[PDB]
Design a protein around this ligand. Structure first.
Ligand SMILES: *[C@@H]1O[C@H](CO)[C@@H](O[C@@H]2O[C@H](CO)[C@@H](O[C@@H]3O[C@H](CO[C@H]4O[C@H](CO[C@H]5O[C@H](CO)[C@@H](O)[C@H](O)[C@@H]5O[C@H]5O[C@H](CO)[C@@H](O)[C@H](O)[C@@H]5O)[C@@H](O)[C@H](O[C@H]5O[C@H](CO)[C@@H](O)[C@H](O)[C@@H]5O)[C@@H]4O)[C@@H](O)[C@H](O[C@H]4O[C@H](CO)[C@@H](O)[C@H](O)[C@@H]4O[C@H]4O[C@H](CO)[C@@H](O)[C@H](O)[C@@H]4O[C@H]4O[C@H](CO)[C@@H](O)[C@H](O)[C@@H]4O)[C@@H]3O)[C@H](O)[C@H]2NC(C)=O)[C@H](O)[C@H]1NC(C)=O
Ligand SMILES: *[C@@H]1O[C@H](CO)[C@@H](O[C@@H]2O[C@H](CO)[C@@H](O[C@@H]3O[C@H](CO[C@H]4O[C@H](CO)[C@@H](O)[C@H](O[C@H]5O[C@H](CO)[C@@H](O)[C@H](O)[C@@H]5O)[C@@H]4O)[C@@H](O)[C@H](O[C@H]4O[C@H](CO)[C@@H](O)[C@H](O)[C@@H]4O[C@H]4O[C@H](CO)[C@@H](O)[C@H](O)[C@@H]4O[C@H]4O[C@H](CO)[C@@H](O)[C@H](O)[C@@H]4O)[C@@H]3O)[C@H](O)[C@H]2NC(C)=O)[C@H](O)[C@H]1NC(C)=O
Ligand SMILES: *[C@@H]1O[C@H](CO)[C@@H](O[C@@H]2O[C@H](CO)[C@@H](O[C@@H]3O[C@H](CO)[C@@H](O)[C@H](O[C@H]4O[C@H](CO)[C@@H](O)[C@H](O)[C@@H]4O[C@H]4O[C@H](CO)[C@@H](O)[C@H](O)[C@@H]4O[C@H]4O[C@H](CO)[C@@H](O)[C@H](O)[C@@H]4O)[C@@H]3O)[C@H](O)[C@H]2NC(C)=O)[C@H](O)[C@H]1NC(C)=O
Ligand SMILES: OC[C@H]1O[C@@H](O[C@@H]2[C@H](O)[C@@H](O)[C@H](O[C@H]3[C@H](O)[C@@H](O)[C@@H](O)O[C@@H]3CO)O[C@@H]2CO)[C@H](O)[C@@H](O)[C@H]1O
Ligand code: NAG
Ligand code: NAG
Ligand code: NAG
Ligand code: NAG
Ligand code: NAG
Ligand code: NAG
Length: 968
């Protein structure tokens, strides 16, 4: 419509007039705020065979103060976009304004709790509130569209606009049309795509006002039961997605904008390791090939890399880690087998244009395979090839199943295997068998083994096939030439030549075989060996791979290596590879250009040999250096009391008064004389402190109080210095009604009730009209028994300044309301020389909150990517306590001893300074009259990786500076 660079038809997108299958991964820049590591992820995604990344922008992080848009430094989208371009990865931009995303407010800033109108509706107050954010974020996106030479090809307005309640005329076409117009008015001309939470047809082309350009929906078919990772429940495998697609949006390519790539894990859950097991390689091969059986043309995996909910950006139900059990782990490693398996499918899609021009049929339990225990879904082409997706009919089956195929080809129907034996499907696996597969003019009549990749080089053609262990396979090629085995044993390889073809049968082996048929070389691999192959694009003009255009795909090389191959480029007589290694690694290059004489790996000339088939070989030795990490318990820990409020000398006269007679919160009307909702006073994040002043009569007995912080929150209450008690918290409770006995009080004396409340984050707003994001935080109800409720005059604080937030570098969410946070002591070089010496391992002897500070040095070597972890012990059932850890001012750990499950906290290079000084600030809150302490506190690492990554620059780490506006 509005530009010629990205168009579509009923089958696929076109980019500059060429069909492409968009295979994408979800990656959120605000969860990895280090620009060099963003590039690392993009390159790891490109190495899967993927061509796109989908991202959210978090409004809450970039407009913490209403009217002040700030997407600078660590929140700057421009280096993220340049890193996508450099990696050769297109982008799907999803700026919301509502994003959900397991984030605080679902993206909405806390100040939306004061908006007089329904969130995500036509109400003018809501739409006005979004205008400054969208005109800024969409203008930045506009500048980096493909129409302006950037990477961004598609735009998503809103997020899962799918269910309404409570008087909203859902779906509101005026609402969606306004949201789409905002983006258009900011210069966005690329196609708009939506993400219906289920396949319900909302906003599809043809629905009139508020229709998007391309209809997308989401799917998490296997669910989120991470505690039972081997259980695949009955009927969870979708079978009707093409049927629903033809009914709801037949004119647009079939698109799943969020397909399950992992799972969330709540406070108290089984842990993200368990989620990786549920959504593992078996899940991918069965569920993702099933999506291929519907001829999906835009597929985005949520998440490909999850990262971290640092600095309180997460929603209340989640904890610090957002690992998500995804293909790329929270610590950026690609060890999980699901990565290597996904790489096989991504590379298959990258070289198979006939996939998008075929004609999909219904699944069948007969006609293609000779057992009803198997299901085959055909994608049939006239001359462009056909595809046959095979799985067990009972998709959860772990049975080993023998079968024969009867397939249609351009040379007629064929019963496979022709030369004898049977095919095998071992349990939770699925195959894409191919017929009339075009390898640059050479016709593969059929292959039962799956295609990984193929290329045409100057000196011939190469095709790479694989199968699982124990399987027999067969292929046929249209040709007059015979077959010869050119590498590996001739055993288990049977052949037959006809007048117009050669048939070849083979058993899968751990040892590679290479056969040759005319100018085609065919590598015959087992799955586990195929995991070690890579297909980098080969740059001749520079060093960057470029986007996956048909030309740059065709000129790729095949590299057998280990952990990672990032790039390849040719320059003069040098073949340059960039790669990473986690072990001593044999490197083989196939398709070396004729002009190349020398092999360089990561800048360094590397000796190579050339075997009889023209394959260059080399070795990269892995010899890890001594990684020396300091013992955190032995540091020079300085302590300060971070709850001075409970001492009688404390003067709170500069605190904001909690004296508002009316709330601006439309969701929940006041049940106290004044509002004690934190967001009414601009406080949306971290720990909240309330102080209630009263004069005693002498007859007081009890104080009852309803506190609300969200799932797994806690609160503690003191009367002057006297500890009344705590709600220690449960995932099940987002609020709690406590009743405390007071000590005997003195007539006419003044007292202060101090209340500490853990704000776990603001709720999401999934159902339009329910306004759940407005769920307040703080005190809902109180009663000083026998006294009118107006007896207590309340003051409060959250982060210092509230919406006039102090740390513009680290963003509006990072810090909360504790004394030591308000003073800025969590930053590098706090004024701690004369503070008491005490360690968090010594801890507290009564209920309270202590603040601990120490520095340490790292001297880790260059050229090594070393994932570092911060560990808090939990070997025995603990007393109830809560811990935050700030690393160079960035909150990178939130720990609740009694709820869990996280004890291991990754912290990226860039936040940590690998050749320099680092600062740890630790708050320790004992919700127990006997106090508490850490069992252990350790810094650890996992496998160092010899890496091609450039220098990781430290992010801005503003040091401590005295604050004018503090209560002091
Ligand atoms: C450097 O980077 C590298 C990446 O570039 C990285 O390599 C990767 O490492 C990861 C692990 O970190 C690998 O992923 C695991 O792979 C395991 C091995 O299975 C795979 O490989 C075999 C063939 O290879 C083997 O055999 C040779 C010897 O012949 C050895 O050289 C190999 O080391 C390997 O041997 C191991 O496994 C044997 C048993 O299989 C053992 O006898 C032996 O002692 C070794 O432990 C294939 O046959 C496998 O295919 C079969 O199984 C898969 C998966 O189940 C099926 O899908 C397939 O159809 C075949 O049947 C397979 O490819 C896996 O065992 C391991 O599996 C599990 O963990 C994941 C979670 O991570 C789960 O999804 C999965 O369900 C499995 O869960 C079990 O294990 C975990 C504990 O780890 C439990 O939580 C869970 O409860 C469950 O345990 C229970 O069930 C099991 C039943 O059999 C059994 O363990 C117990 O009975 C138990 O009760 C996982 O997938 C990855 O493949 C590597 N990738 C590459 C490219 O190499 C390397 O680590 C990095 N290095 C460093 C130093 O950092
Ligand atoms: C790629 O990225 C991944 C994400 O970043 C990353 O995975 C994370 O890795 C860290 C570090 O390894 C994990 O933290 C550790 O978890 C250990 C417990 O989990 C284990 O328990 C089960 C074993 O049956 C399994 O569930 C689990 O395996 C599963 O998960 C694997 C992924 O990790 C997966 O591959 C498997 O297939 C499977 O699904 C796993 O085995 C935990 O033990 C460990 O804590 C110890 O180590 C810390 C660091 O040194 C110490 O500070 C800490 O105190 C613990 O050490 C002490 O306790 C141990 C108890 O046995 C002893 O072994 C130690 O020697 C030590 O002993 C002292 O203390 C004892 C009391 O505790 C006492 O008894 C002793 O006398 C002594 O005083 C740590 O928490 C994290 O969970 C992973 N995160 C996720 C999301 O998976 C992965 O590693 C990356 N890979 C690479 C190569 O980079
Ligand atoms: C340090 O080590 C200590 C000692 O081991 C660790 O302490 C243990 O920590 C466990 C995790 O917090 C804790 O188990 C939990 O205990 C409560 C008991 O009431 C229970 O609610 C928990 O189970 C639910 O919640 C978790 C998530 O927090 C879910 O993963 C789980 O499936 C359960 O979910 C159900 O309840 C939720 C409400 O909270 C619902 O949202 C959810 O949908 C689901 O609801 C269905 O089932 C309910 C009935 O079960 C029903 O009411 C509802 O209608 C639905 O049908 C979990 O068992 C241990 O008790 C605790 N042990 C000790 C000795 O203290 C500590 O965590 C470790 N610390 C660290 C840092 O790792
Ligand atoms: O990363 C998590 C992922 O969750 C996805 O939603 C999940 C299911 O797809 C969705 O059908 C289900 O819908 C729930 C809703 O989440 C709850 O608010 C509940 O009260 O009402 C609905 C019941 O049908 O929610 C699942 C998550 O638990 C999101 O679509 C996706 O964007 C992610 O957030
Ligand atoms: C193929 O599509 C539908 C799936 O809804 C199936 O029920 C039917 O047998 C086939 N369609 C027709 C028109 O026969
Ligand atoms: C096979 O691919 C070549 C490009 O290498 C193309 O010109 C030819 O038309 C293709 N043939 C078919 C039948 O798709
Ligand atoms: C093809 O190769 C086979 C097995 O190596 C051989 O026996 C046969 O004679 C060859 N075909 C022709 C036509 O020569
Ligand atoms: C309680 O604290 C206040 C000031 O915070 C102080 O003035 C008052 O005297 C204290 N009450 C008692 C009984 O000591
Ligand atoms: C919102 O203000 C409108 C007037 O603009 C008024 O009708 C309504 O009572 C107000 N409600 C709340 C909860 O603020
Ligand atoms: C606390 O009491 C209030 C007011 O009666 C009630 O509505 C709320 O549900 C209670 N909270 C819990 C967690 O039961």
């Amino acid at each position: 419509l509005l530009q010629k660079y990205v168009t579509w038809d009923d089958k696929s997108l076109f980019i500059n007039g060429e069909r492409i299958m968009i295979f994408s991964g979800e990656f959120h820049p605000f969860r990895l705020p280090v620009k060099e590591l963003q590039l690392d992820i993009f390159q790891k995604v490109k190495a899967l065979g993927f061509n796109c990344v989908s991202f959210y922008v978090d409004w809450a992080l970039v407009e913490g103060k209403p009217g002040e848009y700030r997407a600078d430094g660590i929140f700057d989208l421009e280096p993220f976009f340049d890193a996508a371009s450099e990696a050769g990865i297109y982008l799907l931009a999803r700026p919301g304004p509502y994003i959900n995303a397991e984030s605080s407010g679902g993206g909405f800033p806390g100040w939306l709790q004061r908006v007089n109108g329904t969130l995500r509706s036509s109400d003018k107050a809501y739409l006005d509130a979004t205008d400054n954010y969208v005109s800024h974020v969409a203008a930045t996106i506009a500048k980096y569209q493909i129409t302006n030479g950037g990477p961004i090809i598609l735009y998503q307005p809103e997020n899962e606009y799918t269910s309404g309640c409570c008087g909203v005329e859902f779906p509101d076409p005026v609402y969606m049309q306004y949201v789409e117009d905002q983006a258009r008015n900011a210069g966005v001309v690329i196609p708009l795509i939506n993400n219906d939470a289920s396949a319900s047809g909302n906003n599809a082309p043809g629905t009139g006002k508020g229709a998007v350009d391309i209809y997308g929906h989401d799917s998490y078919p296997l669910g989120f039961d991470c505690a039972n990772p081997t259980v695949w429940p009955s009927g969870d495998l979708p079978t009707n997605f093409r049927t629903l697609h033809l009914e709801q949006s037949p004119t647009t390519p079939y698109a799943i904008v969020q397909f399950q790539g992992g799972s969330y894990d709540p406070w108290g859950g089984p842990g993200f390791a368990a989620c990786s097991e549920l959504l593992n390689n078996e899940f991918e091969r069965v569920f993702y090939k099933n999506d291929f059986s519907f001829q999906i043309a835009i597929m985005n995996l949520y998440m490909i890399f999850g990262g971290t909910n640092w600095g309180n950006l997460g929603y209340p139900n989640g904890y610090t880690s957002y690992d998500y059990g995804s293909a790329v782990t929270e610590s950026r490693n690609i060890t999980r087998e699901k990565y290597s398996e996904l790489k096989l499918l991504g590379n298959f899609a990258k070289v198979s244009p006939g996939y998008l021009t075929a004609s999909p049929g219904n699944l069948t339990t007969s006609g293609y395979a000779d057992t009803t225990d198997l299901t085959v879904t055909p994608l049939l082409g006239n001359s462009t090839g056909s595809f046959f997706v095979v799985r067990h009919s009972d998709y959860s089956s772990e049975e080993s199943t023998s079968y024969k195929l009867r397939l249609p080809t351009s040379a007629g129907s064929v019963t496979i295997p022709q030369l004898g034996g049977t095919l095998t499907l071992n349990g939770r696996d699925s195959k894409i068998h191919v017929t009339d597969y075009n390898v640059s003019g050479t016709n593969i009549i059929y292959s039962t083994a799956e295609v990984f990749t193929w290329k045409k080089f100057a000196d011939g053609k190469v095709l790479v096939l694989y199968g699982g262990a124990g399987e027999h396979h067969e292929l046929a090629i249209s040709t007059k030439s015979n077959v010869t085995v050119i590498e590996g044993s001739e055993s288990g390889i049977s052949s037959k030549q006809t007048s117009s073809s050669v048939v070849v049968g083979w058993d899968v082996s751990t040892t590679r075989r290479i056969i040759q048929v005319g100018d085609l070389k065919i590598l015959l691999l087992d799955r586990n060996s195929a995991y070690n192959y890579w297909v980098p694009q080969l740059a001749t003009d520079g060093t960057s791979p470029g986007f996956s255009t048909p030309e740059k795909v065709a000129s790729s090389i095949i590299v057998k290596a280990g952990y990672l191959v990032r790039t390849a480029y040719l320059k003069g007589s040098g073949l340059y590879l960039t790669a990473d290694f986690n072990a001593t690694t044999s490197v083989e290059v196939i398709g070396v250009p004729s002009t190349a004489k020398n092999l360089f790996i990561n800048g360094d000339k590397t000796s190579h040999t050339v075997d009889k088939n023209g394959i260059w070989s080399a070795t990269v030795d892995y010899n890890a250096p001594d990684i020396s990490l300091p013992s955190l318990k032995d540091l020079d820990w300085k302590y300060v009391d971070t709850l001075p409020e409970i001492q009688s000398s404390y003067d709170d006269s500069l605190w904001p008064a909690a004296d508002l007679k009316q709330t601006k919160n439309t969701l929940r009307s006041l049940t106290t004389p004044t509002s004690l909702y934190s967001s009414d006073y601009g406080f949306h994040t971290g720990y909240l402190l309330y102080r209630g002043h009263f004069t005693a009569t002498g007859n007081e007995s009890t104080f009852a109080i309803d506190t609300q912080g969200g799932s797994a929150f806690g609160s503690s209450v003191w009367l002057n210095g006297t500890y009344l008690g705590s709600w220690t918290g449960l995932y099940a409770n987002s609020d709690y009604n406590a009743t405390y006995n007071l000590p005997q009080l003195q007539a006419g004396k003044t007292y202060v009730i101090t209340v500490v409340i853990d704000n776990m984050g603001l709720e999401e707003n999934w159902t339009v009209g329910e306004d759940l994001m407005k769920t307040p935080r703080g005190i809902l109800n109180f009663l000083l028994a026998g006294r009118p409720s107006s007896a207590i005059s309340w003051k409060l604080t959250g982060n210092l300044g509230g919406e006039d937030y102090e740390d513009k570098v680290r963003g509006p969410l990072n810090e909360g309301g504790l004394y030591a946070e308000r003073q800025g002591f969590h930053q590098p070089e706090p004024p701690s020389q004369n503070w008491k010496s005490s360690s968090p391992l010594e801890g507290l002897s009564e209920a309270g909150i202590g603040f601990y500070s120490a520095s340490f040095d790292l001297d880790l070597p260059k050229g090594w990517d070393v994932p570092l972890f911060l560990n808090i012990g939990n070997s025995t059932t603990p007393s109830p306590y809560r811990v935050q850890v700030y690393v160079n001012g960035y909150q990178y750990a939130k720990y609740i001893s009694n709820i869990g499950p996280q004890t291991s906290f990754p912290v990226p290079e860039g936040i940590l300074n690998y050749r320099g000084t680092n600062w740890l600030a630790v708050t320790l809150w004992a919700l127990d009259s006997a106090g508490g302490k850490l069992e252990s506190l350790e810094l650890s690492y996992t496998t160092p990786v010899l890496t091609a990554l450039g220098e990781v620059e430290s992010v801005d780490q503003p040091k401590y500076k005295k604050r004018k506006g503090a209560y002091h």
